[PDB]
Write a protein that binds this DNA or RNA. Structure first.
Length: 49
DNA sequence: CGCGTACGTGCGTTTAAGCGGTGCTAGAGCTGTCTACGACCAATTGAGCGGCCTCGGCACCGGGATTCTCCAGGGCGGCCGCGTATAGGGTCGAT
């Protein structure tokens, strides 16, 4: 259930890619062990009807 | 200390208090007679007071009912505040 689409320069995850936070997450250890490029997500989400 | 008003003060208008002069008689005050009522004395009698006793109306109280007295706590709104997020600026790397 970890699926990543890879073709040319396009990379998009079809399953899981969003961290639920680093506080108390063993994935932070994983990110320090495996070359993970983590990017913060701004919670601003406008809505269009 | 501050606000609001009610009473002091002045003036023009208006009422009756005061003066006093005069006349009338009602009622106070004086007087003269006659007596009904009160003081005063004596003898008799019971109404009123000290004493003595018994007894219950109320002082005393422990329990129970009540009638106030005070407050205390929970809820609800406001104000401040710690944490997280988000935008902005600055810095570093790449073209």
């Amino acid at each position: 259930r970890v699926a990543t689409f890879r073709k040319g320069n396009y990379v998009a995850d079809l399953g899981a890619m969003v961290v639920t936070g680093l506080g108390g997450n063993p994935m932070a250890v994983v990110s320090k062990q495996v070359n993970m490029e983590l990017a913060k997500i701004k919670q601003k989400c406008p809505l269009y009807e």
